PDB file of C-alpha atoms in Angstrom:
ATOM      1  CA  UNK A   3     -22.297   8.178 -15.408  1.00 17.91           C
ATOM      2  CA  UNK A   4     -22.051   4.578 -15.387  1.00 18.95           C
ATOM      3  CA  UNK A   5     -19.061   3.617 -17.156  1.00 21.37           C
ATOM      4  CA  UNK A   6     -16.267   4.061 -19.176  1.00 22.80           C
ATOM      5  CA  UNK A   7     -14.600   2.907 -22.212  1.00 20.86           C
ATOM      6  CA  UNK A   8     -11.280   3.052 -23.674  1.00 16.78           C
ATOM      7  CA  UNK A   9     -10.544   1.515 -27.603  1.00 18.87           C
ATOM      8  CA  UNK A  10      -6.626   0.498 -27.538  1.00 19.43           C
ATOM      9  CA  UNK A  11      -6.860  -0.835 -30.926  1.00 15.62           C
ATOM     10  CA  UNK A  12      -4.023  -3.694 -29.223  1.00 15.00           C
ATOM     11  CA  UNK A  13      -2.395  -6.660 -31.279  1.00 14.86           C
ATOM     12  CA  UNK A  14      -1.530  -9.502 -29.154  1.00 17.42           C
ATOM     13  CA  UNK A  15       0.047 -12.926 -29.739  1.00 17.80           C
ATOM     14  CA  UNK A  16      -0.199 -15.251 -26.986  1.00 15.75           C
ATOM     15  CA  UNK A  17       2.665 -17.337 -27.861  1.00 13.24           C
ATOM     16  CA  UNK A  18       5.195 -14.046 -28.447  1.00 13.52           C
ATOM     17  CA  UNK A  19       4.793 -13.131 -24.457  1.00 15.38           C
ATOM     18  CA  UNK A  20       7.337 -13.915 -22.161  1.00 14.64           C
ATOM     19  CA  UNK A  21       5.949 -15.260 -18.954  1.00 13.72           C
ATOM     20  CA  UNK A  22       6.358 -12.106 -16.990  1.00 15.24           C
ATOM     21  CA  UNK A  23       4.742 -10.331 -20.009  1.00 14.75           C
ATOM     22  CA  UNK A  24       1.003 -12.214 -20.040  1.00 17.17           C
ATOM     23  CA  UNK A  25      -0.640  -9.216 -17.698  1.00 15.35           C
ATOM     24  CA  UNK A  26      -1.738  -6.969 -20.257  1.00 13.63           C
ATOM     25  CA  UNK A  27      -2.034  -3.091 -18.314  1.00 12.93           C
ATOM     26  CA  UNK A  28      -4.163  -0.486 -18.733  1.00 13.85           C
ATOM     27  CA  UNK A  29      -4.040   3.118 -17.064  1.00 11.34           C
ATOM     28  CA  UNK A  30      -7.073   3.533 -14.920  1.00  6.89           C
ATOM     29  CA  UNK A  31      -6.191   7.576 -16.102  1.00  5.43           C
ATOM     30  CA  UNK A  32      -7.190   6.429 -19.464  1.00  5.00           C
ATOM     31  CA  UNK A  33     -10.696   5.918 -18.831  1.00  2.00           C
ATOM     32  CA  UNK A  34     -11.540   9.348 -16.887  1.00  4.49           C
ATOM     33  CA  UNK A  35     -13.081   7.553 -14.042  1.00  5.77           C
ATOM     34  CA  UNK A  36     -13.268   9.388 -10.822  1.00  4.22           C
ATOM     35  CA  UNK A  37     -11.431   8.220  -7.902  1.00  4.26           C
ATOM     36  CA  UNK A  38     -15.353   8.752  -6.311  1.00  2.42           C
ATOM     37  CA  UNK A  39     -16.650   5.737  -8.363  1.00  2.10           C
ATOM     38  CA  UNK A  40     -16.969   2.076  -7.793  1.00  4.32           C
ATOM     39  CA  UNK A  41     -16.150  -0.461 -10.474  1.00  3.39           C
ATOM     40  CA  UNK A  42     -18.464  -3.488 -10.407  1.00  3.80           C
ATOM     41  CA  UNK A  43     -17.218  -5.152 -13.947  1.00  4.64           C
ATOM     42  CA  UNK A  44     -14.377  -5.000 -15.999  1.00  2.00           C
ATOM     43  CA  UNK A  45     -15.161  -6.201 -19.867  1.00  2.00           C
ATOM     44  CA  UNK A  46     -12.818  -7.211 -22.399  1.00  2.00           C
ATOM     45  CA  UNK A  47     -13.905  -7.273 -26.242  1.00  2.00           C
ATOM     46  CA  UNK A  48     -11.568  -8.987 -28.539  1.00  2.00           C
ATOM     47  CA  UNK A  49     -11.382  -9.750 -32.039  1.00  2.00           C
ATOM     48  CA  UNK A  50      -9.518 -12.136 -34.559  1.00  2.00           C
ATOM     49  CA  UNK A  51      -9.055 -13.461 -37.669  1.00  2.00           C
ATOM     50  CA  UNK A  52     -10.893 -16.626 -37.483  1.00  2.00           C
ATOM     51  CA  UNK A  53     -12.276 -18.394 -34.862  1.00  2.00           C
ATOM     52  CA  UNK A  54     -11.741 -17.593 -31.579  1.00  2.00           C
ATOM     53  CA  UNK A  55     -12.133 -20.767 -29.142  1.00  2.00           C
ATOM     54  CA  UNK A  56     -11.085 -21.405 -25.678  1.00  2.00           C
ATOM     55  CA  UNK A  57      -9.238 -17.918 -23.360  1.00  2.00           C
ATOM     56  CA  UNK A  58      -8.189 -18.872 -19.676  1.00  2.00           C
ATOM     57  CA  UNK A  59      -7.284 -15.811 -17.554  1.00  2.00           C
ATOM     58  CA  UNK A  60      -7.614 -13.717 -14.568  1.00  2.00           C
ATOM     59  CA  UNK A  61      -7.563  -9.893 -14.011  1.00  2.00           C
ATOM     60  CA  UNK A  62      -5.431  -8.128 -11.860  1.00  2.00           C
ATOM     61  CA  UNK A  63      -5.958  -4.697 -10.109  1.00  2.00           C
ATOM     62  CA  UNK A  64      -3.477  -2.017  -8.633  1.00  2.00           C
ATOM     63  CA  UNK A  65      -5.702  -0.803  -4.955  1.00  2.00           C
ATOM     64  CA  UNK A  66      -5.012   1.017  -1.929  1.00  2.00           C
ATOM     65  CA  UNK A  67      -4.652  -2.032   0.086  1.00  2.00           C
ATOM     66  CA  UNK A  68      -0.675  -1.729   1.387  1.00  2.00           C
ATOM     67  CA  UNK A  69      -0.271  -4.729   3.440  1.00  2.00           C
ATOM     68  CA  UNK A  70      -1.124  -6.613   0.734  1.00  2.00           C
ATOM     69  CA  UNK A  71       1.350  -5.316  -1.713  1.00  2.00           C
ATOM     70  CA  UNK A  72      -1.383  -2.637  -3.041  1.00  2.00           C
ATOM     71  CA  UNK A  73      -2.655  -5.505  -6.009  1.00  2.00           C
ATOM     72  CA  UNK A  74      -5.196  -8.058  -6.161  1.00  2.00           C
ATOM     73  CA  UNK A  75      -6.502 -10.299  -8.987  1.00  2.00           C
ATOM     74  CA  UNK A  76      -9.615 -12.308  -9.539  1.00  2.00           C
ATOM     75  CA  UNK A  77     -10.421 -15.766 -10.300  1.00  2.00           C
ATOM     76  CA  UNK A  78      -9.898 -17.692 -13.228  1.00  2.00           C
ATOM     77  CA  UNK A  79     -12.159 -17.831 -16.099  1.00  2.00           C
ATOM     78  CA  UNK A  80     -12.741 -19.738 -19.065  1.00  2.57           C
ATOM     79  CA  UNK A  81     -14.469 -18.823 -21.893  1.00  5.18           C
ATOM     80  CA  UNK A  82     -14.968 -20.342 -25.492  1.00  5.59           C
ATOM     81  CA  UNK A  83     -15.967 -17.903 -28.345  1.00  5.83           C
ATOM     82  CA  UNK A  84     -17.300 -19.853 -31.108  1.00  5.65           C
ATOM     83  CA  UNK A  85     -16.719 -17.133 -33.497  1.00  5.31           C
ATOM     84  CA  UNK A  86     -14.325 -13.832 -34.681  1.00  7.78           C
ATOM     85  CA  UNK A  87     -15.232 -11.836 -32.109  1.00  6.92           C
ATOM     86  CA  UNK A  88     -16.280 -11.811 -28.027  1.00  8.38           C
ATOM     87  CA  UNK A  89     -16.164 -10.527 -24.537  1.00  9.32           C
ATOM     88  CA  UNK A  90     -14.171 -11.448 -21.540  1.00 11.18           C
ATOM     89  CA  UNK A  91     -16.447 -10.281 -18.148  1.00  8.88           C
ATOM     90  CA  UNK A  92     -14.834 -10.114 -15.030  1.00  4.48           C
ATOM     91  CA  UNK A  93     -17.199  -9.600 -12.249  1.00  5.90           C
ATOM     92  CA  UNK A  94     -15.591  -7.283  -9.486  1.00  6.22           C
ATOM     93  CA  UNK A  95     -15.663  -8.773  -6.041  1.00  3.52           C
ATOM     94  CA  UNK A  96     -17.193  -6.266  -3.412  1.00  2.46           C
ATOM     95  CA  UNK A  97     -14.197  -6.496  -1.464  1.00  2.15           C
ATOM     96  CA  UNK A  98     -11.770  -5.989  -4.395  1.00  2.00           C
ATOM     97  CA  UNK A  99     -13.825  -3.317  -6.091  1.00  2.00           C
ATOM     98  CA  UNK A 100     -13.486  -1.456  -2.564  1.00  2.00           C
ATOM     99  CA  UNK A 101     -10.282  -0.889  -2.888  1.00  2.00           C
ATOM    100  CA  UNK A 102      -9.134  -0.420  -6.371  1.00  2.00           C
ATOM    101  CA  UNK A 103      -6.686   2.281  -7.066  1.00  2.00           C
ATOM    102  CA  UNK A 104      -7.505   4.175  -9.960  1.00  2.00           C
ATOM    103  CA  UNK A 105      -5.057   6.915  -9.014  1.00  2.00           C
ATOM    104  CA  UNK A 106      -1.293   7.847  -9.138  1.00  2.00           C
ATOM    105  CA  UNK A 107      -0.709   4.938 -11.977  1.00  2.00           C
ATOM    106  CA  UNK A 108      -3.185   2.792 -11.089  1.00  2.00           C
ATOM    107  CA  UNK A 109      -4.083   0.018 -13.419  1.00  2.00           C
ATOM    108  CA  UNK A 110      -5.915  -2.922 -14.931  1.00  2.00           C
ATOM    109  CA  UNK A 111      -4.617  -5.608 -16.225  1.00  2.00           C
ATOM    110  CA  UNK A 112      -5.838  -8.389 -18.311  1.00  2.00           C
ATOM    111  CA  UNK A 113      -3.777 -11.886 -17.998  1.00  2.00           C
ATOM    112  CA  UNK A 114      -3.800 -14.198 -20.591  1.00  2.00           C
ATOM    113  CA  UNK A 115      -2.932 -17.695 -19.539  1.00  2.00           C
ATOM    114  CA  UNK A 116      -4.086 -19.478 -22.928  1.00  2.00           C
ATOM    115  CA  UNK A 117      -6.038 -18.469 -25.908  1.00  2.00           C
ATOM    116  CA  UNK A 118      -6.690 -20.828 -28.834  1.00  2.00           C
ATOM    117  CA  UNK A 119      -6.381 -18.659 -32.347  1.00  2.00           C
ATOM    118  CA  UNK A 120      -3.033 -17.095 -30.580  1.00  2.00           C
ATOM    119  CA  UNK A 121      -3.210 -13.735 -32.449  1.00  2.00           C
ATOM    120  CA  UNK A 122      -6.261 -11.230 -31.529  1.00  6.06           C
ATOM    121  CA  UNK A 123      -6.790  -7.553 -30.771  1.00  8.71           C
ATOM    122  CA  UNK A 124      -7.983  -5.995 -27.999  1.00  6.52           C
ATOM    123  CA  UNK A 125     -10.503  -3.940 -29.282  1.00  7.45           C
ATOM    124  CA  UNK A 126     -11.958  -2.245 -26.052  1.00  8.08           C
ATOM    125  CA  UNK A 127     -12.008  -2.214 -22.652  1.00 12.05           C
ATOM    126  CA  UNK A 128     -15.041  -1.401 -20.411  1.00 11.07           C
ATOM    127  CA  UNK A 129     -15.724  -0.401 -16.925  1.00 12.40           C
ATOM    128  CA  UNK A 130     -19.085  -0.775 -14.983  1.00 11.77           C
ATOM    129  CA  UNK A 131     -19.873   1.326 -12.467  1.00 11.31           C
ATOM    130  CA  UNK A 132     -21.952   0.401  -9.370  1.00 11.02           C
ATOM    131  CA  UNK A 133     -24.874   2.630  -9.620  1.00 10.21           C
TER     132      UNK A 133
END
């Protein structure tokens, strides 16, 4: 196949997470994907009560990369939602996508930085496969 999704049904509020606590993680285990397949986007959706407005973030990634601490993370991204509900893309360098460790507790995680409405849920989270 060509992706994967999971549906963690997760509440967040921005301004209740400590700043070692704005990566939100995900088990690469809990999406089924195969240690065989390369991800080439991760997507976010998220949902609020009212409008959503401005998210800054970046992604991070456990890989299999030792000398550099086996993590990576992408670059920043805005994004402004005009309305209740939206997606958060990150495209997947080649060299990061390479490398990511989906095994042994492997994870992705989803970092915060800012969102405007505070309070949303993280409604699912999608890999793309290269294909």
């Amino acid at each position: 196949s060509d992706g994967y999704t999971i549906k963690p049904n997760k509440k967040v509020t921005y301004s209740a997470l400590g700043e070692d606590e704005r990566m939100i993680g995900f088990s690469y285990k809990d999406f089924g994907i195969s240690s065989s397949e390369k991800i080439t986007e991760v997507q976010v959706n998220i949902s609020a009560n009212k409008n959503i407005g401005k998210y800054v973030g970046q992604f991070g990634t456990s890989t299999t990369d030792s000398a550099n601490g086996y993590w990576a993370m992408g670059d920043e991204i805005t994004q402004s939602i005009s309305g209740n509900s939206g997606t958060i893309t990150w495209k997947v360098p080649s060299d990061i996508s390479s490398i990511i460790q989906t095994q042994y507790g492997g994870e992705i995680k989803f970092g915060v930085w800012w969102i405007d409405c505070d309070e949303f849920t993280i409604d699912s989270v999608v890999l793309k496969l290269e294909h």
